[model samples]
Target: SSGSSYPSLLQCLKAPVLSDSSCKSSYPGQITGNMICVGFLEGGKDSCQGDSGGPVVCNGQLQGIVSWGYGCAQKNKPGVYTKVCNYVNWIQQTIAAN
Candidate 1:
């Protein structure tokens, strides 16, 4: 859910890296280059029905927050994320003390 109040610590697992084979349309990063992809890792054996809203962490750091996708499990289209790197500073400031 969203809110008018500022939010700290953007979803930790908003951006995740899965096998190219899993998500064909999901490039390491967006082709439009709106954002860059980092901290790649396998989500798990599979994405659960409740994987959404969960965090995908790597190397003891927040990588991305779960987002929607084409379907639960599609070969060409894997689940998508909000790409937290794009909002790092905003998130940090939101979480920081005034």
Candidate 2:
């Protein structure tokens, strides 16, 4: 929801970390180096529909790319994202080729 006509629609959210093991348990093998899980403790701030593919930055670095989840801010279901570091080589190669 990137809008500038009125108030900025972008939202900055943060929440307690969900253990990797728990996250993996939910999705099984699909959760791997290529993706990671993120969620809010109280089902608060989170990436919703139409927010997929957005950058998930941390400490001035591109950590992940918004991917998917059961629903926005669910209690146990967290947002899964494509791990940026895992694609470094491919990303570099593609950019270098261009």
Candidate 3:
């Protein structure tokens, strides 16, 4: 047991945004409340399965929660996430109530 060890924590990946339009198209006719698109349009880095509820941080601030997407790193299918700023009041109220 003395030989047991674990790797250090790894930093989260940072993928560039391809286009907002691409994200909107993935969910057509939706209000997209508190949702934002992030990832590569040409297919690269993206949050895949088993990454839901993970933080999508930006600018040293908590920006989003991994919500949904068509597929991981697929072309024109950037990862969509729940916008954290949109529920500030609700989040605070929920915490207070608890």
Candidate 4:
């Protein structure tokens, strides 16, 4: 957990719109309110590494941002993200102040 734990990948996987209600039912236990779950329930396909602040968008607004998960793409463990529907206002306010 020093220099480069997980290197960024050149591959880009696209995930369709991720809504609060859509992900909640898929993963009910460990997942919390502020987190959005993406990727297949069976496994495969996920965002990892230094792509932490990457975008998970739908239409025009951001639904989530790559956060954390077990590994690259683990079984029954879809990657997680930070819900942004409730934070765009804060982003604008904070960024605009600078």
TM-score of each: 0.51, 0.79, 0.78, 0.71
- Give the Cα-based TM-score of candidate 3 against the true structure: 0.78
Q: After superposition, how far is residue 11 of candidate 4 from its true place, in Å?
A: 2.3
Candidate 4: list runs displaced more than 4 Å.
Answer: 1-9, 17-29
Please report the TM-score between candidate 2 and the true structure: 0.79
Q: In candidate 1, what are the lDDT values of residues 1-98, reduced to their tens digit?
A: 44454354442233447543444345534433222222233332234345565666777775656666544444444555556667889888988956
Worst 10 residues of 2 by lDDT: 1-10
TM-score head-to-head 3 vs 4, winner: 3
| Local distance difference test scores for all models | 0.50, 0.75, 0.75, 0.74
Q: Over the stretch 50-73, how does candidate 3's per-residue lDDT look in tens digits?
A: 678889777878888888888788
RMSD of each: 8.7, 3.3, 4.7, 3.4
Model 1 RMSD, rounded to 1 decimal: 8.7
Tell me the tens digit of each residue's lDDT in model 4 across 1-98: 33557544455777654555656655666677778887766667788778798888777777889988778777756778988886888989999998
lDDT for 14 in candidate 1 is: 36
